[PDB]
């Protein structure tokens, strides 16, 4: 019946479930699974996969699926930390957006229309090919999809200068539960607000984003330097880092990746300056001479080169390859936001725990700059002025280490518990792109839970959105009153008597 409907509407790229591991079905399913944690045979699998190739095909796919009792799952880049783009407890149809990867750059307006299956890498590549003086603010990872990423905000190395990806969206096409094709004018300002950070898989299917392209100099300066030190020095480096990072002028970003193994600690310092190396080095010589950076550490390159470089890619060309796997290890990750400086002992204890688990690592970013100049309700992402750091904890492993899975997860749980007193509280804050089901989830098939969905969902909802939660609920009720777009942590609509 679904097939018949799709055909009647001219949607032809559809593949039904197959038990054949070599089937095209399995191939399409796995192409965009970015967390191996959700690849095994015990995981839920879609009853069919649809690859729409135009806005009409996307609209008609939604309309046809609704005539059945299927749960809709949308996938862009497949980076969901919890696999929420390609898993469901209820029978589901996977709408994979990989064929919707057209990027149209308008150099006369310095804007771009970006189909929602496009990855960050594809977008960055298109921009740098078009111009040496334009860039865009989003995350570091080139295989992340614009569909999920911009829907949830999108933080990166230029956010201290330009905010989130979603903060630079000026129009969008949203396909709603009825298949309506809505631009900013059609959807209204509440829904246009909601989609710019309120989370993917909740409002409808974004077909395309219209973004403002942003000025960058023809040469920027970056560094990527790993310090191999002991815990005393590593602790003093991280403790000073937090102040340097949040306080730097907006034209600078300094972030850190860290890990350890017994007495050996490694800290990778990632630096970005919107300008030339003389100014970059003068600034860090003054503010953070403890890093011991030398002239040869500072590299001048184009903006496009800088984003490929910071992502650990070999070439700018690699930005344009959506299936170049970033890691291929199963992982679990959690995140904290902070409001008060971290005491030295927090870094010391964090490093002690990393030293006991070499499969763990941390990623540290400062806010401030433009992030403090954007109001908390400009878009749904609320963590602006007053927010100091974002702190990510990751544990990752390969197939040969699967037996240790339980141990790895226990380690991560204990790290998060250790950090509790030092980070944001009441509530402990989060970030919707860093979706975390440990916070809880709604079973939309459970009547008693659904009756109390607003209060239950406040647990994660207020962590992700703070006071923006209420306006999000109103927007959800307007655009998807029947809850066609849902997942364990989707914004609840209000139900009528
Ligand atoms: C995997 C990963 C993620 C990541 C990162 C590095 C890696 C290796 N670095 C990030 C960074 O530097 N800054 C940042 O803000 N986030 C970073 N992330 C996390 C990433 O933002 C999120 O995982 C993001 O949501 C992923 O988006 P993607 O599009 O790749 O993922 P998805 O699984 O397919 O979708 C996620 C959710 O959104 C819904 N979705 C997908 N497409 C649409 C459209 N077009 N319309 C509406 N909803 C959509 C999915 O259904 C799912 O709910
Ligand atoms: C449904 O969509 C999928 C995914 O886009 C289609 O598969 C893709 O088809 C294109 C065109 O055949 C393939 O590109 C080709 O690649 C070869 C190298 O193998 C290259 O030499 C050609 O220039 C050509 O571009 C592409 O590989 C393939 N992608 C995947 C992931 O399989 C599929 O054809 C569509 N199905 C239907 C029924 O329309
Ligand atoms: C190259 O610089 C960076 C590298 C990694 C990160 C953290 C990144 C991450 C990196 C991985 O490799 C990975 O798989 C195991 C999982 C995760 C999920 C969290 N995510 C955001 C941030 C960076 O700035
Ligand atoms: C609904 O959810 C509640 C709380 O999670 C659970 O106790 C109960 O068993 C569920 N009810 C049904 C009928 O599944
Ligand atoms: Mg076979």
mmCIF file of N, CA, C and O in Angstrom, residues 342-399:
data_model
loop_
_atom_site.group_PDB
_atom_site.id
_atom_site.type_symbol
_atom_site.label_atom_id
_atom_site.label_comp_id
_atom_site.label_asym_id
_atom_site.label_seq_id
_atom_site.Cartn_x
_atom_site.Cartn_y
_atom_site.Cartn_z
ATOM 1 N N UNK A 342 35.890 26.418 36.835
ATOM 2 C CA UNK A 342 36.194 25.106 37.399
ATOM 3 C C UNK A 342 37.406 25.225 38.309
ATOM 4 O O UNK A 342 38.409 25.834 37.935
ATOM 5 N N UNK A 343 37.327 24.645 39.510
ATOM 6 C CA UNK A 343 38.503 24.676 40.378
ATOM 7 C C UNK A 343 39.573 23.737 39.842
ATOM 8 O O UNK A 343 39.268 22.776 39.124
ATOM 9 N N UNK A 344 40.825 24.017 40.184
ATOM 10 C CA UNK A 344 41.934 23.191 39.740
ATOM 11 C C UNK A 344 41.690 21.703 40.024
ATOM 12 O O UNK A 344 42.001 20.850 39.192
ATOM 13 N N UNK A 345 41.117 21.398 41.188
ATOM 14 C CA UNK A 345 40.901 20.010 41.594
ATOM 15 C C UNK A 345 39.931 19.266 40.681
ATOM 16 O O UNK A 345 39.963 18.039 40.609
ATOM 17 N N UNK A 346 39.069 20.001 39.984
ATOM 18 C CA UNK A 346 38.159 19.373 39.034
ATOM 19 C C UNK A 346 38.948 18.858 37.835
ATOM 20 O O UNK A 346 38.753 17.722 37.393
ATOM 21 N N UNK A 347 39.848 19.685 37.316
ATOM 22 C CA UNK A 347 40.716 19.240 36.229
ATOM 23 C C UNK A 347 41.650 18.115 36.681
ATOM 24 O O UNK A 347 41.858 17.148 35.951
ATOM 25 N N UNK A 348 42.201 18.236 37.884
ATOM 26 C CA UNK A 348 43.091 17.202 38.405
ATOM 27 C C UNK A 348 42.368 15.856 38.465
ATOM 28 O O UNK A 348 42.882 14.852 37.973
ATOM 29 N N UNK A 349 41.166 15.849 39.036
ATOM 30 C CA UNK A 349 40.388 14.628 39.171
ATOM 31 C C UNK A 349 39.950 14.063 37.836
ATOM 32 O O UNK A 349 39.891 12.845 37.639
ATOM 33 N N UNK A 350 39.630 14.954 36.908
ATOM 34 C CA UNK A 350 39.237 14.542 35.574
ATOM 35 C C UNK A 350 40.413 13.857 34.884
ATOM 36 O O UNK A 350 40.253 12.813 34.253
ATOM 37 N N UNK A 351 41.601 14.442 35.010
ATOM 38 C CA UNK A 351 42.796 13.852 34.425
ATOM 39 C C UNK A 351 43.172 12.527 35.101
ATOM 40 O O UNK A 351 43.643 11.604 34.440
ATOM 41 N N UNK A 352 42.966 12.431 36.412
ATOM 42 C CA UNK A 352 43.218 11.176 37.118
ATOM 43 C C UNK A 352 42.349 10.071 36.525
ATOM 44 O O UNK A 352 42.809 8.957 36.281
ATOM 45 N N UNK A 353 41.082 10.382 36.289
ATOM 46 C CA UNK A 353 40.166 9.392 35.748
ATOM 47 C C UNK A 353 40.501 9.026 34.299
ATOM 48 O O UNK A 353 40.432 7.856 33.918
ATOM 49 N N UNK A 354 40.879 10.017 33.499
ATOM 50 C CA UNK A 354 41.336 9.746 32.138
ATOM 51 C C UNK A 354 42.577 8.847 32.142
ATOM 52 O O UNK A 354 42.739 7.994 31.268
ATOM 53 N N UNK A 355 43.450 9.035 33.128
ATOM 54 C CA UNK A 355 44.691 8.262 33.177
ATOM 55 C C UNK A 355 44.415 6.776 33.416
ATOM 56 O O UNK A 355 45.244 5.924 33.091
ATOM 57 N N UNK A 356 43.240 6.476 33.959
ATOM 58 C CA UNK A 356 42.852 5.100 34.256
ATOM 59 C C UNK A 356 42.074 4.456 33.111
ATOM 60 O O UNK A 356 41.793 3.257 33.132
ATOM 61 N N UNK A 357 41.732 5.255 32.109
ATOM 62 C CA UNK A 357 40.930 4.772 30.995
ATOM 63 C C UNK A 357 41.352 5.451 29.698
ATOM 64 O O UNK A 357 40.777 6.469 29.304
ATOM 65 N N UNK A 358 42.360 4.884 29.023
ATOM 66 C CA UNK A 358 42.896 5.500 27.804
ATOM 67 C C UNK A 358 41.909 5.563 26.637
ATOM 68 O O UNK A 358 42.184 6.263 25.663
ATOM 69 N N UNK A 359 40.785 4.858 26.727
ATOM 70 C CA UNK A 359 39.767 4.953 25.682
ATOM 71 C C UNK A 359 38.856 6.167 25.870
ATOM 72 O O UNK A 359 38.017 6.466 25.017
ATOM 73 N N UNK A 360 39.023 6.860 26.990
ATOM 74 C CA UNK A 360 38.268 8.072 27.243
ATOM 75 C C UNK A 360 39.021 9.308 26.800
ATOM 76 O O UNK A 360 40.254 9.321 26.756
ATOM 77 N N UNK A 361 38.277 10.349 26.454
ATOM 78 C CA UNK A 361 38.881 11.652 26.217
ATOM 79 C C UNK A 361 37.882 12.765 26.491
ATOM 80 O O UNK A 361 36.691 12.514 26.680
ATOM 81 N N UNK A 362 38.382 13.991 26.558
ATOM 82 C CA UNK A 362 37.539 15.150 26.792
ATOM 83 C C UNK A 362 37.763 16.188 25.709
ATOM 84 O O UNK A 362 38.831 16.251 25.090
ATOM 85 N N UNK A 363 36.738 16.989 25.463
ATOM 86 C CA UNK A 363 36.839 18.110 24.544
ATOM 87 C C UNK A 363 36.326 19.338 25.270
ATOM 88 O O UNK A 363 35.234 19.322 25.854
ATOM 89 N N UNK A 364 37.119 20.408 25.244
ATOM 90 C CA UNK A 364 36.809 21.618 26.001
ATOM 91 C C UNK A 364 36.721 22.841 25.102
ATOM 92 O O UNK A 364 37.639 23.116 24.332
ATOM 93 N N UNK A 365 35.621 23.579 25.214
ATOM 94 C CA UNK A 365 35.417 24.807 24.451
ATOM 95 C C UNK A 365 34.948 25.937 25.339
ATOM 96 O O UNK A 365 34.133 25.735 26.239
ATOM 97 N N UNK A 366 35.447 27.136 25.078
ATOM 98 C CA UNK A 366 34.950 28.316 25.756
ATOM 99 C C UNK A 366 33.822 28.954 24.971
ATOM 100 O O UNK A 366 33.765 28.876 23.744
ATOM 101 N N UNK A 367 32.907 29.587 25.691
ATOM 102 C CA UNK A 367 31.913 30.442 25.063
ATOM 103 C C UNK A 367 32.420 31.879 25.153
ATOM 104 O O UNK A 367 33.614 32.120 24.953
ATOM 105 N N UNK A 368 31.552 32.830 25.477
ATOM 106 C CA UNK A 368 31.962 34.223 25.462
ATOM 107 C C UNK A 368 31.937 34.774 24.051
ATOM 108 O O UNK A 368 31.355 34.173 23.146
ATOM 109 N N UNK A 369 32.578 35.921 23.854
ATOM 110 C CA UNK A 369 32.514 36.598 22.576
ATOM 111 C C UNK A 369 31.078 36.792 22.139
ATOM 112 O O UNK A 369 30.225 37.215 22.923
ATOM 113 N N UNK A 370 30.802 36.477 20.880
ATOM 114 C CA UNK A 370 29.482 36.685 20.319
ATOM 115 C C UNK A 370 28.418 35.829 21.012
ATOM 116 O O UNK A 370 27.239 36.179 21.003
ATOM 117 N N UNK A 371 28.826 34.717 21.622
ATOM 118 C CA UNK A 371 27.858 33.863 22.316
ATOM 119 C C UNK A 371 27.233 34.595 23.503
ATOM 120 O O UNK A 371 26.104 34.293 23.897
ATOM 121 N N UNK A 372 27.947 35.571 24.057
ATOM 122 C CA UNK A 372 27.412 36.366 25.161
ATOM 123 C C UNK A 372 26.632 37.592 24.700
ATOM 124 O O UNK A 372 26.011 38.279 25.514
ATOM 125 N N UNK A 373 26.664 37.869 23.403
ATOM 126 C CA UNK A 373 25.976 39.040 22.859
ATOM 127 C C UNK A 373 24.648 38.693 22.194
ATOM 128 O O UNK A 373 23.896 39.578 21.784
ATOM 129 N N UNK A 374 24.365 37.401 22.097
ATOM 130 C CA UNK A 374 23.114 36.918 21.540
ATOM 131 C C UNK A 374 22.168 36.616 22.701
ATOM 132 O O UNK A 374 22.563 35.972 23.677
ATOM 133 N N UNK A 375 20.934 37.105 22.616
ATOM 134 C CA UNK A 375 19.984 36.910 23.706
ATOM 135 C C UNK A 375 19.620 35.435 23.865
ATOM 136 O O UNK A 375 19.672 34.658 22.907
ATOM 137 N N UNK A 376 19.260 35.053 25.083
ATOM 138 C CA UNK A 376 18.932 33.661 25.365
ATOM 139 C C UNK A 376 17.726 33.149 24.590
ATOM 140 O O UNK A 376 17.566 31.945 24.443
ATOM 141 N N UNK A 377 16.868 34.047 24.110
ATOM 142 C CA UNK A 377 15.721 33.594 23.325
ATOM 143 C C UNK A 377 15.756 34.037 21.862
ATOM 144 O O UNK A 377 14.752 33.944 21.157
ATOM 145 N N UNK A 378 16.911 34.500 21.393
ATOM 146 C CA UNK A 378 17.048 34.813 19.973
ATOM 147 C C UNK A 378 16.676 33.587 19.135
ATOM 148 O O UNK A 378 15.919 33.681 18.163
ATOM 149 N N UNK A 379 17.211 32.439 19.539
ATOM 150 C CA UNK A 379 16.812 31.144 19.008
ATOM 151 C C UNK A 379 16.642 30.221 20.216
ATOM 152 O O UNK A 379 16.913 30.628 21.344
ATOM 153 N N UNK A 380 16.174 28.982 20.004
ATOM 154 C CA UNK A 380 15.937 28.122 21.172
ATOM 155 C C UNK A 380 17.165 27.765 22.027
ATOM 156 O O UNK A 380 16.985 27.474 23.202
ATOM 157 N N UNK A 381 18.374 27.781 21.471
ATOM 158 C CA UNK A 381 19.563 27.499 22.274
ATOM 159 C C UNK A 381 19.759 28.619 23.290
ATOM 160 O O UNK A 381 19.979 29.768 22.909
ATOM 161 N N UNK A 382 19.679 28.294 24.590
ATOM 162 C CA UNK A 382 19.573 29.358 25.593
ATOM 163 C C UNK A 382 20.872 29.725 26.296
ATOM 164 O O UNK A 382 20.882 30.674 27.092
ATOM 165 N N UNK A 383 21.939 28.981 26.030
ATOM 166 C CA UNK A 383 23.165 29.102 26.817
ATOM 167 C C UNK A 383 24.088 30.165 26.247
ATOM 168 O O UNK A 383 25.004 29.874 25.473
ATOM 169 N N UNK A 384 23.826 31.406 26.643
ATOM 170 C CA UNK A 384 24.500 32.564 26.073
ATOM 171 C C UNK A 384 25.288 33.284 27.162
ATOM 172 O O UNK A 384 26.142 32.667 27.778
ATOM 173 N N UNK A 385 25.018 34.566 27.412
ATOM 174 C CA UNK A 385 25.743 35.276 28.465
ATOM 175 C C UNK A 385 25.673 34.512 29.785
ATOM 176 O O UNK A 385 24.618 34.002 30.162
ATOM 177 N N UNK A 386 26.805 34.431 30.476
ATOM 178 C CA UNK A 386 26.879 33.702 31.729
ATOM 179 C C UNK A 386 27.392 32.281 31.574
ATOM 180 O O UNK A 386 27.871 31.685 32.541
ATOM 181 N N UNK A 387 27.291 31.726 30.367
ATOM 182 C CA UNK A 387 27.823 30.391 30.100
ATOM 183 C C UNK A 387 29.311 30.508 29.821
ATOM 184 O O UNK A 387 29.717 31.283 28.953
ATOM 185 N N UNK A 388 30.120 29.737 30.545
ATOM 186 C CA UNK A 388 31.574 29.844 30.432
ATOM 187 C C UNK A 388 32.173 28.794 29.509
ATOM 188 O O UNK A 388 32.866 29.131 28.553
ATOM 189 N N UNK A 389 31.919 27.520 29.802
ATOM 190 C CA UNK A 389 32.535 26.433 29.045
ATOM 191 C C UNK A 389 31.541 25.373 28.634
ATOM 192 O O UNK A 389 30.505 25.201 29.272
ATOM 193 N N UNK A 390 31.891 24.655 27.572
ATOM 194 C CA UNK A 390 31.259 23.390 27.233
ATOM 195 C C UNK A 390 32.317 22.309 27.410
ATOM 196 O O UNK A 390 33.437 22.437 26.909
ATOM 197 N N UNK A 391 31.959 21.254 28.134
ATOM 198 C CA UNK A 391 32.878 20.186 28.488
ATOM 199 C C UNK A 391 32.282 18.856 28.053
ATOM 200 O O UNK A 391 31.243 18.432 28.566
ATOM 201 N N UNK A 392 32.929 18.197 27.101
ATOM 202 C CA UNK A 392 32.437 16.923 26.592
ATOM 203 C C UNK A 392 33.299 15.777 27.107
ATOM 204 O O UNK A 392 34.529 15.882 27.143
ATOM 205 N N UNK A 393 32.649 14.688 27.509
ATOM 206 C CA UNK A 393 33.337 13.481 27.962
ATOM 207 C C UNK A 393 32.962 12.360 27.009
ATOM 208 O O UNK A 393 31.781 12.098 26.792
ATOM 209 N N UNK A 394 33.958 11.694 26.441
ATOM 210 C CA UNK A 394 33.705 10.647 25.465
ATOM 211 C C UNK A 394 34.436 9.373 25.848
ATOM 212 O O UNK A 394 35.571 9.421 26.317
ATOM 213 N N UNK A 395 33.788 8.229 25.659
ATOM 214 C CA UNK A 395 34.506 6.963 25.681
ATOM 215 C C UNK A 395 34.185 6.217 24.385
ATOM 216 O O UNK A 395 33.032 6.181 23.950
ATOM 217 N N UNK A 396 35.213 5.673 23.741
ATOM 218 C CA UNK A 396 35.055 5.049 22.427
ATOM 219 C C UNK A 396 35.889 3.787 22.330
ATOM 220 O O UNK A 396 36.953 3.694 22.938
ATOM 221 N N UNK A 397 35.417 2.816 21.556
ATOM 222 C CA UNK A 397 36.113 1.542 21.471
ATOM 223 C C UNK A 397 35.892 0.839 20.136
ATOM 224 O O UNK A 397 34.909 1.096 19.443
ATOM 225 N N UNK A 398 36.820 -0.043 19.782
ATOM 226 C CA UNK A 398 36.695 -0.831 18.562
ATOM 227 C C UNK A 398 36.103 -2.209 18.844
ATOM 228 O O UNK A 398 35.892 -2.579 20.000
ATOM 229 N N UNK A 399 35.837 -2.966 17.784
ATOM 230 C CA UNK A 399 35.189 -4.269 17.913
ATOM 231 C C UNK A 399 35.949 -5.235 18.821
ATOM 232 O O UNK A 399 35.341 -6.025 19.543
#
